[PDB]
Design a protein around this ligand. Structure first.
Ligand SMILES: Nc1nc2c(ncn2[C@@H]2O[C@H](COP(=O)(O)OP(=O)(O)OP(=O)(O)O)[C@@H](O)[C@H]2O)c(=O)[nH]1
Ligand SMILES: [Mg+2]
Length: 323
């Protein structure tokens, strides 16, 4: 069945998704930050990537921006100028540089009225993140069930304290890939095809990596999987609870059958292995510790048990209760 659970899922979905109102304030915030960039560099562009761009944002969403420019112009100099304009415009934040990568972290806004806790990260020529976001955007457009599924999983993972990359668990991006991987390579019939392995896929190389995938989305047949949202979620919790073998396997988008061992990859951290679809050298689950993985797995199991439970009524609410 899953009829009541599905109904419940859409109810929570409508409560947790970014309201149209907040979306518009974030968009106005973007226009403001672009005006400040025009004052410093007329030829640079400021693009949004990540969850706001792909439509996978919860309420109180952070903003992820990227500055594009001529590669022959050094990003640290324009970054510092952009930072000084932002301070002068009444934004508060930090300017930092890990290795050769400059980053601005905006933490507040004191004048333009976008919040006392306005959070916004700004990178420089982070072209790979843009492409990651193009991929997720295209899937989101491809099946309407992806968006609610992702948000519910994100919301679940926050409530269970298993969404902390700094404390031994997994990033939200990591959970998006686990979902997508399930929808492409596990569920039968598949919900989505692998756009990177499409025969129609055209190679496009950016910063050393191949970011090509099939984006002629209107030519793709709709899914032959008719599962309800509730059923997809249960399938997803079931798979990572009982079927997926984190000790030996890699979540991957580069194999026709989704099979990849850690040994082929040389991934002896790699407690949990998720191969970024484009940046294949990057293990998205590298933040996941031993105890972190134990808790992630246990929560997957507990979510399965709950949806499989025989005691009626099933306390669906306890899926989003704090651990
Ligand atoms: N977190 C994360 N993001 C990456 C990574 N590599 C590229 N990115 C890009 O950076 C974006 C950061 O998005 P997140 O902050 O993880 O997603 P989010 O919805 O804002 O996270 P929450 O607000 O906690 O729900 C992703 O959407 C990717 O496009 C990575 O290794 N980890
Ligand atoms: Mg983010």
């Amino acid at each position: 069945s899953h009829k009541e659970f599905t109904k419940f899922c859409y109810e929570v979905y409508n409560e947790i998704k970014i309201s149209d109102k907040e979306f518009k304030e974030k968009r106005a915030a973007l226009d403001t930050l672009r005006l400040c960039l025009k004052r410093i560099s007329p030829d640079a562009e400021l693009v949004a990537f990540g969850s706001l761009e792909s439509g996978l944002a919860l309420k109180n969403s952070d903003m992820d921006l990227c500055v594009l420019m001529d590669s022959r112009v050094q990003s640290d100099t324009i970054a510092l100028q952009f930072y000084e304009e932002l301070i002068a415009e009444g934004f508060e934040g930090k300017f930092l540089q890990r290795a050769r990568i400059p980053i601005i972290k905006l933490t507040s806004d004191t004048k333009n009225g976008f919040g006392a806790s306005f959070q916004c990260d700004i990178g420089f020529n982070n072209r790979l993140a843009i492409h990651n976001t193009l991929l997720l955007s295209s899937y989101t457009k491809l099946d309407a069930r992806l968006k609610p599924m992702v948000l519910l999983v994100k919301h679940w993972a926050k409530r269970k304290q298993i969404n902390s990359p700094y404390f031994g668990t997994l990033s939200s991006y990591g959970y998006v890939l686990m979902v997508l991987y399930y929808l492409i390579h596990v569920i039968k019939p598949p919900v989505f095809p692998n756009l990177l392995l499409s025969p129609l896929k055209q190679e496009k190389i950016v910063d050393g990596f191949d970011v090509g995938f099939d984006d002629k989305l209107e030519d793709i047949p709709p899914s032959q999987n008719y599962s309800s949202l509730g059923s997809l979620l249960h399938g997803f919790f079931r798979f990572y609870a009982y079927k997926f073998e984190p000790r030996e396997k890699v979540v991957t988008f580069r194999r026709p059958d989704g099979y990849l061992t850690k040994q082929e990859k040389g991934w002896t951290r790699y407690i949990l292995a998720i191969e970024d679809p484009f940046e294949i050298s990057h293990n998205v689950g590298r933040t996941v510790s031993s105890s972190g993985l134990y808790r992630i797995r246990g929560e997957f199991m507990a979510a399965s048990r709950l949806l499989n439970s025989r005691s009626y009524p099933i306390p669906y609410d306890s899926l989003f209760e704090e651990a």
